[PDB]
From a paper:
The catalytic module with the Ino80 (ATPase) RecA lobes and insert, Arp5, Ies6, Ies2, Rvb1 and Rvb2, constitutes the core unit of INO80 (C-module). INO80 slides nucleosomes with 40 bp of flanking DNA ~100-fold slower than nucleosomes with 80 bp of flanking DNA, displaying a switch like response to flanking DNA length.
To assess whether the nucleotide state affected the location of the Arp8 module, we determined structures of S.c INO80 on 0/80 and 0/40 nucleosomes in the presence of a non-hydrolysable ATP analog (ADP/BeFx). The overall structure of INO80 bound to 0/80 nucleosomes in the presence of ADP/BeFx is similar to the previously published structure in the apo state. Although at a lower resolution (~11.2 Å), we can dock the previously published atomic model of the S.c Arp8 module bound to the HSA region of the ATPase into this density. For X.l nucleosomes, no difference is observed between the previously published structure in the apo state and the structure determined here in the presence of ADP/BeFx, suggesting that the nucleotide state does not influence the Arp8 module’s conformation on X.l nucleosomes. In contrast, on 0/80 nucleosomes, where the Arp8 module engages the flanking DNA, this location of the Arp8 module potentially represents a sliding-competent state of INO80. The interaction of the Arp8 module and HSA with flanking DNA seen on X.l 0/80 nucleosomes is consistent with prior studies implicating the HSA in nucleosome sliding.
Author numbering:
A (entry chain G): 16 to 119
B (entry chain C): 16 to 121
C (entry chain F), D (entry chain B): 25 to 103
E (entry chain E): 41 to 136
F (entry chain A): 42 to 134
G (entry chain H): 29 to 123
H (entry chain D): 31 to 122
Amino acid sequence: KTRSSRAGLQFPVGRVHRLLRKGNYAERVGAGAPVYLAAVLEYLTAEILELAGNAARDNKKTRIIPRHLQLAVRNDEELNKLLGRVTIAQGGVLPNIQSVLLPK
Amino acid sequence: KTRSSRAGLQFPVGRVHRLLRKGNYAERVGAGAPVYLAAVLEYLTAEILELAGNAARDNKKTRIIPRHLQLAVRNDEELNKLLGRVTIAQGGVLPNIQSVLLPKKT
Amino acid sequence: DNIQGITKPAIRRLARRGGVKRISGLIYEETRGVLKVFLENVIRDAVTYTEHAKRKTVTAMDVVYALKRQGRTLYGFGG
Amino acid sequence: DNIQGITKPAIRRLARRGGVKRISGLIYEETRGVLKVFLENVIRDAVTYTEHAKRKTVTAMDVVYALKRQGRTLYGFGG
Amino acid sequence: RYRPGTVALREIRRYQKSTELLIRKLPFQRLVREIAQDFKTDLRFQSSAVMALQEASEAYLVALFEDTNLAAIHAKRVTIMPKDIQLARRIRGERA
Amino acid sequence: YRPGTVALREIRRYQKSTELLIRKLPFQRLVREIAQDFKTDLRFQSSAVMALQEASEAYLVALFEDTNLAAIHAKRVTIMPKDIQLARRIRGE
Amino acid sequence: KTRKESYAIYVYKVLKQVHPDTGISSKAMSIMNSFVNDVFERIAGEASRLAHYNKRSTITSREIQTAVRLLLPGELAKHAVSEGTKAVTKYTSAK
Amino acid sequence: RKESYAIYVYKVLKQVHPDTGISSKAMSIMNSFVNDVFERIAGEASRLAHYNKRSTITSREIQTAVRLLLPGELAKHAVSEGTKAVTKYTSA
DNA sequence: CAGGATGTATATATCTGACACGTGCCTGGAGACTAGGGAGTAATCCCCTTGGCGGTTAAAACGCGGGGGACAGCGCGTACGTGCGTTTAAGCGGTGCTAGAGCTGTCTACGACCAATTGAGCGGCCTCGGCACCGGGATTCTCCA
DNA sequence: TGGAGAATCCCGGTGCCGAGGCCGCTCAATTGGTCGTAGACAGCTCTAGCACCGCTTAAACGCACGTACGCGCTGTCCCCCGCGTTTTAACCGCCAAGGGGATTACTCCCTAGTCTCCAGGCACGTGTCAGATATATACATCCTG
């Protein structure tokens, strides 16, 4: 009878409430705030993993590689806006050429 | 009796301790932390105000306006890189001219 | 036309304070668009900063907090 | 002279990753300088992070906290 | 008659030692109300709210114009052009 | 003997793949040289310098992208150090 | 003999819910866990300071909703707002 | 009851420059500056205490945060003021 | 180089609005004393870091032709710089009104907190299949005679 | 431009080691009750934010003329790239020594908490004087000679 079952989310609600409580963010934590935070974290995880699995499908591997995660977040525009100041380890860069660099 | 007089400072030790308590930075706060923060605010305030007073002095003015604070901040390369992402209202910019714009053969 | 309310000599003055000598003719509406997207990014944060407070009047305080959120914190208006 | 251990084709490989075709012969000392000053900017913060913990070994955790200080945060070692 | 390029350079110093606001207050106020009406209707603004909004606006404007000036200098030119603005907002990371 | 297309092949190869570019032990000892300046006889985790290498060269290739854009803006294809101080001052360091 | 908490199994369940045939590597698993930890810290810190800005000692769902609207770009922000809102009314409709 | 640090830096200005005054806009800027430094230093000390699983913030975290987020000579003279103040305070 | 033409710096008269200083008061900081739990300190141990040997070879160092790009010089045509007449809207002052910020009183529902209960979650272990890698053949692919 | 040769893609086979599921324990999540106070709601106040009108005045706008500067073209030379040859330091693998990070246990003292008191800091009022405004004058550049 976990709270994540009645919240409908696979992400933990009690763990998020525990980290919100002794994380000294505030002295009082509401009831719907951990389930809202867990829902947003669920959505962001799903948004990462959907294009990660899609890039794995174009790369014809069934394992998520940090290169696949980097290609997922850098090819998607608001995902790159959210993740502009992070660097992904073993992820590389997008393959791009400036138009004046090609010969002829 | 005043803890700032006990620490020999002008900034309030008790007020810094109060906003450290209610600023929910930790569950508990020590005794040397508010006097250390008061000494740091002492020194940084003295350093900005000294160059601000010098910038007022060579402008022959006995009043500190934000242009003097802007001149004090950007002249020295320590507090300028401390707060390089900070804009000051009524501040202006340091007079800087790139050398390729001046006319030659004059 | 209200975006064009800020004008050619005002843009030329702001660029001149920025230390430029010669300005091309295609500069002005480009920096008009730059100012428009900058005020979009600031005002979009500020409007929900007022909206959370059960408030419908934008103060100077939440503008300072929005500019602190974009890493361009501004002094002289409290905070 | 172990700064020279970052070697002549290492800058070339990093520039080919960066999408640069032709590079100058005087570019190497300058990027060695910028890599050196970046490393003393990050490593010093990691050293004080280690020093506060009464520790004399540098983990990767305080390394990524020092990266988090400069707005250059890293994923894959903060677990 | 002045040589073209020296009275502008003269009033460079006049606007560079100065500190007041370059843009007029009323068109900026009307522009701010226009762009803030789209997020939520019938808003109200404090007097210092639009005064603080202009401060960062011209601060960002002249911080960008420093950048476009010394980006157009590097291309062996004097006139600033819109591709130096693209260069400034690209290297700063504000565009991509 | 192709005149200039080896460099484009190297560009495509290195942007396609994602291994570590800077050679390991010279970097691992350069970390030791810089760390001796702050506190002597410092021990280092292997994963610490493993994270530091991917921290350093990601910044390096972002910088190289920036001076590539500066060199293209200067109507050239060869990067000079003037593009490097362009990138550093304009981006904010 | 130690204990270290992580979100490996939860994003595993999310991954098998959205892609029921794709696996994940351990390095990518740590990248995933560090990403969700970083954005959790970001939203929690913004909600904390936003509650401090309104002299409120309680973090309700409104603070999380406002911090989500601040830290996320537009259609992603309102999609996350919709997911959070439907989660709150789903939890409130149930006991 | 609006809370501010005006008269403290007024005594600081009088003991560092006894023949000048300060405007009200510069007063707002100085108050915002000292508040921004307070928030930065206290937040760094907060997450530094959290990083080591310590619930108490003492002068050690404040000193290390000062060494972290201030530049070199500024931080060196800042800790030179801070430990001298903590030794003057702990002696009485 | 040398003499007019202006824009900028320097010197009084003054005047006004912001700034320095005095006053009450009240709320927030200080004095004193206790509880307890969080930090300090010590002993153990075992993982993980440091150091060394030695074979191997990929990679770095070096040298040399050559070609193509950086850079200097020159011509041009146009697009901004500068000045002047004119319109126009910003700025300032006044009035007037009301929507909406700010604060005080209540109470109640929501959240902290503790005891009892238990099952999801995490360390250890084991297995097999996705994937890295080697090798031969087909497929582009780019330079030239 | 066909084609010689070089790089690349692809398919088949192999072998490996880390994903991924199972199992046992455990401690953190869940449930139930209490009780304390944070904020939701109403209502009163009052203040500053639109809303409009009139003057005035310096800023903006349109236009005329010019010139210098950005851009296109050409020559040159030099310096970096491609490639062959030589060397050298990184990589892999393995083996010990021990160092200190982490764990657990026991104490102690330091800070939260509470009560009482009093004085420092803030709102407000008011002189007062230093920067703003105006007028007159020297002078430091630029423009053409």
